């Protein structure tokens, strides 16, 4: 199932060498392993939280000219 708890930004979002945006998140929930809810395009095939402790890297292709992770849901502007 989908992750039901909170995500926190572990590092400021940056542009990668291959023109995507890299989003490092840390999960706060009890339900890991779980699927990361993602809404704006997702580049990471199956963004999943393996362990609560382990931060995870998410890559996205931003459209020209807002990103939501989780469901107090993490909000990112680009």
């Amino acid at each position, epitope marked *: 199932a989908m992750c039901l708890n909170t995500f926190v930004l572990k590092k400021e979002v*940056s*542009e*990668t*060498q*291959h*023109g*995507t945006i*890299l989003i490092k998140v840390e999960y706060k929930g009890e339900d890991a392993p779980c699927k990361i809810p993602f809404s704006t395009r997702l*580049i*990471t*095939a199956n963004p999943v939280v393996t362990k609560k402790e382990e931060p995870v*890297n998410i*890559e996205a292709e931003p459209p020209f000219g807002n990103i939501v992770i989780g469901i107090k849901a993490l909000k990112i502007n680009w």
Partner: antibody, heavy 117, light 108 residues
Framework: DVQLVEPGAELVQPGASVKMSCKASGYTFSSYWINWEKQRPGKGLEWIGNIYPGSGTVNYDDKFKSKATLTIDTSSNTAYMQLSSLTSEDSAVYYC??????????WGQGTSVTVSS | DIVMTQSQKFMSTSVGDRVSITCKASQNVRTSVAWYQQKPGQSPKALIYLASNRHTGVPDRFTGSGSGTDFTLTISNVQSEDLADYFCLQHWTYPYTFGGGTKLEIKR
């Protein structure tokens, strides 16, 4: 002409640390990414990480987070890689390369690191 | 991480023949695949960018093809100078990963 200058060799003892340079010339240092690679004989090349001098962005392959430290000096157009807590597994040729949307384009001559007592 | 598989560790080819070196990605990398040539005691040289584009100065004998998961480097009219290790690299997402390489042996 794009050139990435690296020292030929480094001889270090187990448990020590080594810092190697990658001096860029023939292009604007702050406009391109620099990649760092490890190559052990008869082994698959590995990507250690990358660095963007124009912004200070550093990305590590998680496999090298406990081994490598990437830094830059825009004033001297130089990128550096430090390898610490050295073991024989770190004996390898370390390449820097210029990067971007087309991946590694120009590669340095590589620094051959020998870890031995 | 993405695994780039080059199943052929060695490929043997007669002078003047064509050789096709394969590179299989563990997931879809679109066209974000580069091919490099490495001769002994030398640094790798960039041959192909974005799966099918030849770098300036690279002979037209070298051709890159494929998308998704199946990539191929084709060398036509194989010469004594092509004796080298050829490897692929995916740069679709971090960490970038390389194929294990294919050593091209010239048959005589």
């Amino acid at each position: 002409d794009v050139q990435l200058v690296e020292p030929g060799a480094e001889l270090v003892q187990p448990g020590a640390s080594v810092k190697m340079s990658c001096k860029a010339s023939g292009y604007t240092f702050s406009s391109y990414w620099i990649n760092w690679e490890k190559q052990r004989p008869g082994k698959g090349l590995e990507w250690i990480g990358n660095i963007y001098p124009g912004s200070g962005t550093v990305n590590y392959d998680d496999k090298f987070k406990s081994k490598a430290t990437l830094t830059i000096d825009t004033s001297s157009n130089t990128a550096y890689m430090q390898l610490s807590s050295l073991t024989s597994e770190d004996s390898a040729v370390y390449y820097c390369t210029r990067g971007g949307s087309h991946a590694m384009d120009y590669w340095g001559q590589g620094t051959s690191v020998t870890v031995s007592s | 991480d993405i695994v780039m598989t080059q199943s052929q560790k060695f490929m043997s080819t007669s002078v003047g023949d064509r050789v096709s070196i394969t590179c299989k990605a563990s997931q879809n990398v679109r066209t974000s695949v580069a091919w490099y040539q490495q001769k002994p005691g030398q640094s790798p040289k960039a041959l192909i960018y974005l799966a099918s584009n030849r770098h300036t100065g690279v002979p037209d004998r070298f051709t890159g093809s494929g998308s998704g998961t199946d990539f191929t480097l084709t060398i036509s009219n194989v010469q004594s100078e092509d004796l080298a290790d050829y490897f692929c690299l995916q740069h679709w997402t971090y960490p970038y990963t390389f194929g294990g390489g294919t050593k091209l042996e010239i048959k005589r």
